[model samples]
Target: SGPPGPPGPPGPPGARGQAGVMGFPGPPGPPGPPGRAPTDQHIKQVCMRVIQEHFAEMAASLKRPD
Candidate 1:
């Protein structure tokens, strides 16, 4: 073929892909044991840990330079 013609323009994206096949069901397992709900102390502890790990860093990084 003649010197390769100018490279063809990039093609449009193909049609949206079809969905994949559905998954199979899994075997059942024994029922889980009951547990106590979170108490005030537990809730506060979790909140503090979350703030220190996530929110604390962002606040320190994004704070104003003033």
Candidate 2:
């Protein structure tokens, strides 16, 4: 064709709504327990256990096989 191209038509309106407002705070909640999650030592201990098992298996593999 002679002409390159024409601009597209306008798009439909957006579905977004107006900004909302925050309400008053609710009644006081019950008290939670002391601690939340496990400490770092527990994780280190578990990791060490896995490493120990791996080392044992590796050392045993070094032996002469039948």
Candidate 3:
């Protein structure tokens, strides 16, 4: 009202930008599987396996121009 009283402090922020977060579940995923199991010290993966046989059959069944 009185010449706006020489401006003012920005009123300490009507709002502030906030940071967001993200995370992953890691494969063999998720739940009602809630809670969890322990022990990773004894885990191992020797080789990737012969699943190409399974996939090959699936692909051939679909058929294609090529």
Question: Could you arrange the candidates by TM-score from highest to lowest?
Answer: 1, 2, 3
- Model 3 residue runs over 4 Å out of place are 1-4, 14-22, 29-66
In Å, residue 47's CA in model 1 sits off its true spot by 0.2
Q: Write the per-residue lDDT of candidate 3 for residues 1-66, one digit (tens) a residue.
A: 455566665766568678877776668645565566544542322122344437786688679756
**Best model per TM-score:** 1
Candidate 1, residues 5-28, lDDT tens digits: the string is 788889999999899989998889
Better of 1 and 2 by lDDT: 1
* Better-scoring candidate (lDDT), 2 or 3: 2
TM-score, cand. 3: 0.22
Each candidate structure's TM-score, on Cα atoms with residue i matched to residue i, is 0.35, 0.30, 0.22
Number of backbone-clashing residue pairs for each candidate, in the order shown? 0, 0, 0
Clashing pairs in 3: none
lDDT digits (tens) for residues 1-66 of candidate 2: 598788888999999998898898998998888886767998899988898879868778878484
Error of 2 at 55 (Å): 1.2
Q: Give Cα distance to truth, residue 50, candidate 2, Å.
A: 0.6
